[PDB]
Amino acid sequence: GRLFQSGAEVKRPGASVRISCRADDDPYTDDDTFTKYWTHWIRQAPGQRPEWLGVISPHFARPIYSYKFRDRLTLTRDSSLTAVYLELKGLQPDDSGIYFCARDPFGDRAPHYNYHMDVWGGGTAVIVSS
Amino acid sequence: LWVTVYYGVPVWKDAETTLFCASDKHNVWATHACVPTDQEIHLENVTEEFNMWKNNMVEQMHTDIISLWDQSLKPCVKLTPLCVTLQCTNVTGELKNCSFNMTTELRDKKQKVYSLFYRLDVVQINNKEYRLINCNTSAITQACPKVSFEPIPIHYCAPAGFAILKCKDKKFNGTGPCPSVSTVQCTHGIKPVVSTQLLLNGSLAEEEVMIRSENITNNAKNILVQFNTPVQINCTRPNNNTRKSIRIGPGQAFYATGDIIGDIRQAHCNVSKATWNETLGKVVKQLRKHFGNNTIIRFANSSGGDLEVTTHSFNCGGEFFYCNTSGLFNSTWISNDSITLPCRIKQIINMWQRIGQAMYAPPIQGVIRCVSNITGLILTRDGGSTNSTTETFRPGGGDMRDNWRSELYKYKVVKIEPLGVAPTRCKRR
Amino acid sequence: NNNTRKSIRIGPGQAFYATGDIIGDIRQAHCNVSKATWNETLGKVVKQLRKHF
Amino acid sequence: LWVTVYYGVPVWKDAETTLFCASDKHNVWATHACVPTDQEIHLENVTEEFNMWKNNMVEQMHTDIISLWDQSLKPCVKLTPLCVTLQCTNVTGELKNCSFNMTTELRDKKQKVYSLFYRLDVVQINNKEYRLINCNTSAITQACPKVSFEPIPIHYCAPAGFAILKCKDKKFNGTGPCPSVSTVQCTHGIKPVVSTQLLLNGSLAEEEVMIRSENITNNAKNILVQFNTPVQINCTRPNNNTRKSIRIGPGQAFYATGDIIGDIRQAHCNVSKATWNETLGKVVKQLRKHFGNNTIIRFANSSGGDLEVTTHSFNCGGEFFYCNTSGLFNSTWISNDSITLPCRIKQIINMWQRIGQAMYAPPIQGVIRCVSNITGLILTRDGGSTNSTTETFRPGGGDMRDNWRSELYKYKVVKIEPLGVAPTRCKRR
Amino acid sequence: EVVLTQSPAILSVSPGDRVILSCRASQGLDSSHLAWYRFKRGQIPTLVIFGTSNRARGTPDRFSGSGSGADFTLTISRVEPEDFATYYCQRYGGTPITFGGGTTLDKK
Amino acid sequence: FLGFLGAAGSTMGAASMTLTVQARNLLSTVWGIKQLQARVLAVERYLRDQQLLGIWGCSGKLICCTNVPWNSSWSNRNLSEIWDNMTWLQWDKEISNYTQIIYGLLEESQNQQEKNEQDLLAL
Amino acid sequence: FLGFLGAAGSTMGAASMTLTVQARNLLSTVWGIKQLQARVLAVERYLRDQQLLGIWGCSGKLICCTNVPWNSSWSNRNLSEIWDNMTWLQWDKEISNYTQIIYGLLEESQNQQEKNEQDLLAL
Ligand SMILES: *[C@@H]1O[C@H](CO)[C@@H](O[C@@H]2O[C@H](CO)[C@@H](O[C@@H]3O[C@H](CO[C@H]4O[C@H](CO)[C@@H](O)[C@H](O[C@H]5O[C@H](CO)[C@@H](O)[C@H](O)[C@@H]5O)[C@@H]4O)[C@@H](O)[C@H](O[C@H]4O[C@H](CO)[C@@H](O)[C@H](O)[C@@H]4O)[C@@H]3O)[C@H](O)[C@H]2NC(C)=O)[C@H](O)[C@H]1NC(C)=O
Ligand SMILES: *[C@@H]1O[C@H](CO)[C@@H](O[C@@H]2O[C@H](CO)[C@@H](O[C@@H]3O[C@H](CO[C@H]4O[C@H](CO)[C@@H](O)[C@H](O)[C@@H]4O)[C@@H](O)[C@H](O[C@H]4O[C@H](CO)[C@@H](O)[C@H](O)[C@@H]4O)[C@@H]3O)[C@H](O)[C@H]2NC(C)=O)[C@H](O)[C@H]1NC(C)=O
Ligand SMILES: *[C@@H]1O[C@H](CO)[C@@H](O[C@@H]2O[C@H](CO)[C@@H](O[C@@H]3O[C@H](CO[C@H]4O[C@H](CO)[C@@H](O)[C@H](O)[C@@H]4O)[C@@H](O)[C@H](O[C@H]4O[C@H](CO)[C@@H](O)[C@H](O)[C@@H]4O)[C@@H]3O)[C@H](O)[C@H]2NC(C)=O)[C@H](O)[C@H]1NC(C)=O
Ligand SMILES: *[C@@H]1O[C@H](CO)[C@@H](O[C@@H]2O[C@H](CO)[C@@H](O[C@@H]3O[C@H](CO[C@H]4O[C@H](CO)[C@@H](O)[C@H](O)[C@@H]4O)[C@@H](O)[C@H](O[C@H]4O[C@H](CO)[C@@H](O)[C@H](O)[C@@H]4O)[C@@H]3O)[C@H](O)[C@H]2NC(C)=O)[C@H](O)[C@H]1NC(C)=O
Ligand SMILES: *[C@@H]1O[C@H](CO)[C@@H](O[C@@H]2O[C@H](CO)[C@@H](O[C@@H]3O[C@H](CO[C@H]4O[C@H](CO)[C@@H](O)[C@H](O)[C@@H]4O)[C@@H](O)[C@H](O[C@H]4O[C@H](CO)[C@@H](O)[C@H](O)[C@@H]4O)[C@@H]3O)[C@H](O)[C@H]2NC(C)=O)[C@H](O)[C@H]1NC(C)=O
Ligand SMILES: *[C@@H]1O[C@H](CO)[C@@H](O[C@@H]2O[C@H](CO)[C@@H](O)[C@H](O)[C@H]2NC(C)=O)[C@H](O)[C@H]1NC(C)=O
Ligand SMILES: *[C@@H]1O[C@H](CO)[C@@H](O[C@@H]2O[C@H](CO)[C@@H](O)[C@H](O)[C@H]2NC(C)=O)[C@H](O)[C@H]1NC(C)=O
Ligand SMILES: *[C@@H]1O[C@H](CO)[C@@H](O[C@@H]2O[C@H](CO)[C@@H](O)[C@H](O)[C@H]2NC(C)=O)[C@H](O)[C@H]1NC(C)=O
Ligand SMILES: *[C@@H]1O[C@H](CO)[C@@H](O[C@@H]2O[C@H](CO)[C@@H](O)[C@H](O)[C@H]2NC(C)=O)[C@H](O)[C@H]1NC(C)=O
Ligand SMILES: *[C@@H]1O[C@H](CO)[C@@H](O[C@@H]2O[C@H](CO)[C@@H](O)[C@H](O)[C@H]2NC(C)=O)[C@H](O)[C@H]1NC(C)=O
Ligand SMILES: *[C@@H]1O[C@H](CO)[C@@H](O[C@@H]2O[C@H](CO)[C@@H](O)[C@H](O)[C@H]2NC(C)=O)[C@H](O)[C@H]1NC(C)=O
Ligand SMILES: *[C@@H]1O[C@H](CO)[C@@H](O[C@@H]2O[C@H](CO)[C@@H](O)[C@H](O)[C@H]2NC(C)=O)[C@H](O)[C@H]1NC(C)=O
Ligand SMILES: *[C@@H]1O[C@H](CO)[C@@H](O[C@@H]2O[C@H](CO)[C@@H](O)[C@H](O)[C@H]2NC(C)=O)[C@H](O)[C@H]1NC(C)=O
Ligand SMILES: *[C@@H]1O[C@H](CO)[C@@H](O[C@@H]2O[C@H](CO)[C@@H](O)[C@H](O)[C@H]2NC(C)=O)[C@H](O)[C@H]1NC(C)=O
Ligand SMILES: *[C@@H]1O[C@H](CO)[C@@H](O[C@@H]2O[C@H](CO)[C@@H](O)[C@H](O)[C@H]2NC(C)=O)[C@H](O)[C@H]1NC(C)=O
Ligand SMILES: *[C@@H]1O[C@H](CO)[C@@H](O)[C@H](O)[C@H]1NC(C)=O
Ligand SMILES: *[C@@H]1O[C@H](CO)[C@@H](O)[C@H](O)[C@H]1NC(C)=O
Ligand SMILES: *[C@@H]1O[C@H](CO)[C@@H](O)[C@H](O)[C@H]1NC(C)=O
């Protein structure tokens, strides 16, 4: 359906940002997205194409990182299994942009094994300034 | 030339069908409800296309293991009275001694009881006040203490009109044409061993270490490694545990941990250091065939996730073990003594990631020891910067379809198409 | 009424869904029918009803 | 001589198959779900081997009666709040007036109610403090007061390709060759009458008293006695019971005993004394054909066990009766008036001996009378010193397969084998 | 590393015309691995086409895709006023997932 | 008319005139699935016998003369004492341990006649 | 004896002598209904093939010569390279897209032979 992200952030250089992504804004939901789908994290700085940051697995929340973000990105799932989180540390002014979570079968669903970010969510604007 | 109808031609197509179980104290996998077993016919000149990554038998086996698990757990005790405040002290921080008020078989009476809980199964509320870990989100069902978790070999048989083709190519990478094919009635005995990062008690490769990926150039794909010789692993929960029964309702018994008798010690697993290093050299040699001879092969530990996938997670004896494998994957490969891996124990398990369900594993009386065979690995390759001469491999897993893909890779279900037509010089008189 | 839904945790894994606030005015639920369209349809029903009575 | 193939030959073999029900206000045995009934073909020159002691129809009937019983108890009221402390006085020892606190439909409100309980249903905790008899071990479910326990005759029909052979030998001892065979598709109406020590409302033997053991020289084997004429038995619970409905939860009603209107009296059964003595003489005469003419035949009372088997246990009107039959089996036999047998009533029943399950029979309003036919016995012989001239027989039972074996002894299931091969002088052209 | 190139960065059209958008890859794509995405400022991104030719659920029949090897096209049969957005191709089959630069449509 | 299995005590020759009577009777909640999968049992038990008749060239027949010769290693009783003394149950208990090789011989003979008839239809 | 599907790599002429081996193998709680409705599917898949054979006039036969002429628009190979070079799997891959029209041709041809032998038996 849709994906629900947290609010826009203003941060200092050298700090960390933490973004949430939910498939249901009900806190006591039983949605079972994030146990069925992979969740991609994708940023877009102004004047640039989208850049892929990482993906988190439905399987036991195993993350695949991009190599240029591996030393300062953490991808987490909630212990209630109903929200996923991005944590970007050591922020710089080129980390500013709109951050998206996207939902993907990712070649893993048993009939057809397709690949599509079919449900995107929102976008959290992240500004890094001093 | 007239057309001629033949019935019973040896023709098949690819198919998906329901397979049934055969199997040669009750169990989680209800093999007592399966069929008795009985066979193998070689098919000369037959080259058959296999794909272990798009195999519907793997998906059916996954659905069957999950359905047998939650069918084994319906009639057992719901631990909804155990969602109370606990007053917990330390036993000596890894174990808590927790006291609580419990219902009895009389609705108007209470009971002050205690139990030993692991730290991984309790969260504090802000001696201190705790509660069980999945108590706000989940209904917890206690596993039934006479029901065994020990994996029993099951066989998957095709119904009538369907066949199971078996690849006998001993160096088969799981995708493509196989030229050595047989027809079987069912598969070999496949033990549903639930495990992460290390394949346990499986079948070995015939000649060499096998490296199998769906696409070895796609680093998001898992790499299944099949060993040719096993590495035995010895695990123990050394604490002498006492189980205590608490009557919590009419006909309802919660099973607590009573006293530890003797020393408090850590659960651990032991691998032979030289045997593990030999197997890692064989894995590196088979792994250099896809990445270059001058590639540095690095083994690092797990990249993240839930505790099931950051550890070697397994069940044996009825306890659920979560073992740090940093001692196993810590090495760089250029062109008597034991490795001792510490393990933690959980009792509140959520194996299939069901939202709002959890299982309480009841405590096992006595000391647990366990001798298994590491027969394979699940690995993940890090994404490289494409100017790199180093490939880093980390222990993967978490998808149990890769555990059962490592036993069903050689198998295939086909549908027999017995009706053929062909030109002949016949004519109906 | 602009209804607010509120989740209450009433047991382990169990959520009751309550009504929270109304945001804005309290008004009555209602249905609208076109008056002329309804009258014309009632005339057609009456004409088909006079054939039996 | 060539082989010729015949299809449809009258050939059978012995077989086990699932039989289905037919039957000519809902009941415990769901005969409304059975098919309607409809056919009896005599088979000349056929001698067929029967064994009433290894009959699979008896085992299927047992499994079916237990499954129907626990199917009709699933939708009914679970008496989990009834497991509380009771404060009990005597109604006058055998009846207790017990007062307790009970849940209401509102979760925050309690209710002080009372009920009359039988003494066999309560155990004291050390007016006095009591609780129900199976509250610590069993979940108790209240039997649904619109559901009838009255035995409806059911018929067991064989599926297609199967037949039911029927022995028509009127002096058949239930094992060996029967030379008067018929074929039916289903049995006569068999009433599932659950009783011990005495067979009630059954079929009579045709000419004489029948004595049937699996081996009359093995004293661990039960002796089924079939009467040729019935002995009628008149039982009553003379108390005028008052039923009272208690709302114990939303939509949940407990059924209590309210007042007794009039006298407090004992439940009892009456047998005609001369009729019972004449039947016991016929049994003794048929019993001397296996143990000698000069044998002293003794009838003593039950050797021990649970109350269901030390008494004649039955169900009439919805109440469960446990009658002392010491006045029926008290006699020694060398070569208007009634016997009055006192009965106790239970309301908490564990009929199929399931661990952790019990049934609460709700009270029946008014006065209960039932007139039944004793149509047989289940006896057990005592082991003797082998130099003894006395055989003591005691009332037995407890295995309900002996109840249903006394109606299914003449029946048999066979599988039709229609395809035969033979030699003739034919030849295919 | 696979780099995707989308050939005209701005493309101008009138409502009701047929438009070709092109994606050029540096090597040999699998064609189950190429998708198209509609980005407009202030709106949720949307999957248009996956698997080189498959329409999404909420995607009208005016969009289709074709291609093979390293050449991929997304064609709009009749341009509507809501189809005036940036369109990106992206490639699966190895991490990092890479996007394609983008072709923005403006009206005449 | 004797009814279903009425000729079970009759001689084999007398019982062979009642084969339709046995043939037509071979096909037709706790009490729910008991009624259900009994029907699947009856259907597959019928279809296996029909498949056996089909691969011997005996489909649609109740009596089917074949080309397989009667081995005296099976039974050496003569024709008069088989069809006028024995019943079918006694005969089944006699030749129960030669049935699978008789069945294999019928299955050989019919496939041989099939391809022989196919070869002479090409003339 | 090669066994079930043993002649799948054999030539079509050599595999046509093993048709009984494939023919007789076509008919015979979480695990409970998985065992159950597989049986109903096997019975249905058997019965629609037997219905197709009865519709074309081939019931009770494993090889059945017909009256429909072989169109050369289906395959133009000669008999020596069909029956001694191809296998049945290769042949099924070759004529897979011409199958339903051959089936319709057999269905119309047998109905015309039915009406012709009905009209001929009235004389
Ligand atoms: C593991 O992962 C890798 C990485 O993806 C896989 O490698 C890729 O596999 C795909 C499989 O679909 C390959 O695509 C095929 O390419 C072949 C060969 O292409 C050559 O021949 C063509 C003639 O048919 C020719 O036109 C091609 O030219 C185009 O491509 C080049 C780039 O290679 C480009 O520069 C040109 O300008 C052209 O655009 C090329 O010379 C091709 O024959 C296939 O086409 C078939 O299939 C398509 C769609 O199915 C169909 O439309 C066609 O009509 C035809 O039927 C197909 O495109 C791809 O080339 C591989 N890329 C690399 C870098 O290796 C690998 O397969 C994976 N392995 C496993 C085991 O999964
Ligand atoms: C988890 O936490 C629980 C607390 O909830 C601990 O349980 C307690 O453990 C202590 C110590 O082991 C127990 O105390 C012992 O009780 C014995 C029996 O008591 C007698 O006297 C009482 C009245 O005082 C009677 O009611 C009773 O019937 C007995 O007759 C004592 O004998 C013990 O004395 C010890 O010290 C003397 C020296 O002074 C020795 O000579 C003795 O032999 C003996 O060793 C002692 O006082 C207490 O009873 C437990 N409570 C409960 C509720 O069980 C668990 O031990 C803890 N578990 C872990 C693993 O940490
Ligand atoms: C990989 O494969 C290996 C080998 O198959 C597995 O290791 C076995 O694991 C089982 C646990 O499921 C072990 O069985 C347990 O052994 C305990 C001790 O056994 C010793 O002592 C008994 C007598 O006390 C001897 O008969 C026996 O041979 C041993 O010498 C028992 O106490 C356990 O009892 C349990 O089962 C019984 C069954 O009746 C129940 O009654 C009990 O209540 C209790 O539940 C049990 O028998 C076995 O010893 C292990 N073998 C070895 C060689 O270590 C691994 O588990 C497997 N790995 C994975 C991940 O699956
Ligand atoms: C099992 O145990 C329960 C106790 O839990 C018994 O129930 C009690 O039984 C007694 C005796 O039958 C009941 O007491 C009677 O109450 C009648 C009604 O009370 C009026 O007055 C009160 C205020 O005092 C009002 O609240 C009420 O609404 C009525 O207006 C009285 O009339 C009775 O008096 C009797 O004696 C006089 C002579 O003194 C006569 O003239 C009267 O006609 C009458 O016969 C008497 O006091 C009591 O109410 C019951 N309690 C409950 C909770 O029900 C069961 O009887 C017992 N069962 C068995 C089988 O043992
Ligand atoms: C052996 O076989 C005998 C004979 O069949 C059984 O005896 C019968 O048992 C049943 C149940 O115990 C008796 O039926 C009950 O009779 C009560 C009184 O019946 C008289 O009054 C009614 C009018 O009120 C007359 O119609 C009737 O003919 C009698 O004269 C009824 O109150 C009972 O009602 C129950 O069933 C109705 C049915 O709708 C329900 O609505 C009620 O709520 C209630 O549950 C019931 O009808 C019957 O009278 C007995 N017959 C004789 C001759 O005594 C034995 O039970 C059986 N033995 C064993 C061990 O199974
Ligand atoms: C029980 O064990 C826990 C775990 O070791 C103790 O908690 C720690 O106590 C030390 C003591 O200085 C603190 O520095 C840590 O911050 C505590 N850990 C946490 C996670 O808060 C606890 O103190 C022990 N209780 C007793 C009474 O010794
Ligand atoms: C794992 O346990 C096994 C026992 O199951 C150990 O194997 C034994 O080792 C000793 C000494 O090397 C031999 O004498 C025995 O013959 C071995 N077998 C048995 C059955 O006892 C093994 O050493 C252990 N491995 C580790 C790493 O601790
Ligand atoms: C992983 O490997 C590193 C490097 O081999 C280990 O670090 C060494 O540990 C030894 C033993 O304490 C020290 O003597 C060395 O100084 C350490 N550093 C180096 C560079 O060798 C580390 O212990 C290993 N970890 C595990 C869990 O096995
Ligand atoms: C019911 O609502 C519909 C809208 O769904 C109304 O229909 C509109 O009416 C206006 C004014 O008459 C027109 O301009 C629109 O074209 C109509 N359609 C739509 C889709 O908006 C209708 O008037 C309402 N009916 C009643 C009785 O209130
Ligand atoms: C209620 O009835 C019981 C049963 O008769 C009484 O219990 C007996 O009382 C006598 C009186 O002396 C004792 O001798 C017995 O030992 C008691 N029986 C048991 C099993 O303990 C009880 O006294 C009665 N209550 C009242 C108040 O009379
Ligand atoms: C039902 O609950 C009431 C409480 O409302 C109980 O009455 C109390 O009994 C205790 C003794 O156990 C006394 O100390 C209290 O004074 C009583 N009253 C209150 C208000 O607590 C009563 O015992 C319970 N049981 C029955 C059968 O009525
Ligand atoms: C059991 O009850 C029956 C009644 O159901 C009694 O039979 C009646 O007895 C009287 C007197 O002997 C006769 O006049 C009646 O004709 C009998 N039948 C009926 C239907 O009333 C019988 O006597 C009782 N038996 C015992 C042992 O008490
Ligand atoms: C069992 O039989 C014995 C012996 O016949 C009965 O005991 C006799 O009972 C009568 C009546 O009370 C006495 O007059 C006799 O003195 C008793 N003894 C003897 C030796 O006859 C006993 O009553 C019978 N029990 C039952 C339950 O019927
Ligand atoms: C049961 O067996 C008897 C004895 O053989 C059969 O009686 C014979 O019937 C045939 C009819 O075909 C006569 O030819 C014989 O003469 C009769 N013999 C005698 C001694 O009566 C009888 O027919 C058999 N019954 C059935 C139903 O088969
Ligand atoms: C597999 O293929 C080989 C190669 O054609 C077959 O070998 C031939 O078998 C036939 C028997 O019908 C002989 O006439 C040929 O001379 C053989 N050729 C060669 C080159 O050996 C073999 O029979 C096939 N196997 C099966 C089971 O069909
Ligand atoms: C058949 O064999 C029996 C038994 O030896 C014999 O009595 C009978 O005469 C034989 N019949 C013929 C026709 O030979
Ligand atoms: C039939 O053959 C079996 C072979 O096992 C043998 O046991 C049996 O006795 C034989 N029956 C007869 C009647 O010879
Ligand atoms: C059979 O016809 C289909 C038509 O859909 C075609 O796609 C296929 O290529 C044809 N096969 C052969 C072998 O000609």
Numbering used by the authors:
A (entry chain N): 2 to 35, 35A, 35B, 35C, 35D, 35E, 35F, 36 to 52, ...
B (entry chain G), D (entry chain P): 34 to 57, 65 to 78, 82 to 135, 152 to 185, 188 to 309, 312 to 321, 321A, 322 to 397, ...
C (entry chain J): 300 to 309, 312 to 321, 321A, 322 to 353
E (entry chain O): 1 to 27, 27A, 28 to 107
F (entry chain F), G (entry chain C): 519 to 546, 569 to 663
Verbatim from the authors:
Here we describe bNAb 1-18, a VH1-46-derived CD4bs antibody that exceeds the potency and breadth of most classical VH1-46- and VH1-2-derived bNAbs. 1-18 and 1-55 recognized the CD4bs similarly to other VH1-46-derived bNAbs, including 8ANC131 and CH235.12 (Bonsignori et al., 2016, Zhou et al., 2015), with interactions encompassing contacts with the N276gp120 and N197gp120 glycans, the CD4bs loop via the CDRH2, the V5 loop via the CDRH2, and loop D via the CDRL3.
However, in addition, 1-18 contacts Env by residue F54HC, which is buried in the gp120 ‘Phe43 pocket’, and by residue R64HC, which makes a salt bridge with V5 residue D457gp120. We hypothesize that the R64HC-D457gp120 salt bridge is a crucial interaction between 1-18 and gp120 that potentially allows it to tolerate common routes of Env escape within the V5 loop. In addition to the canonical VH1-46 contacts, 1-18 contains a six-residue insertion in its CDRH1, resulting in a negatively charged 25DDDPYTDDD33 motif that interacts with the adjacent gp120 protomer. At the adjacent protomer, four Asp residues in the 1-18 CDRH1 (D25HC, D27HC, D31HC, and D32HC) plus T30HC form coordinated interactions around the highly conserved Env residue K207gp120. In addition, the increased length of the 1-18 CDRH1 places Y29HC in a position to interact with residues in the V3 loop on the adjacent protomer (S306gp120, R308gp120, A316gp120, and Y318gp120). Although not all of the Asp residues in the 1-18 CDRH1 contact positively charged residues on gp120, the Asp-rich insertion may have been selected to carry an overall negative charge that is electrostatically attracted to the positively charged patch within the V3 loop on the adjacent protomer, which could drive formation of an initial Env-antibody complex (Schreiber et al., 1996).
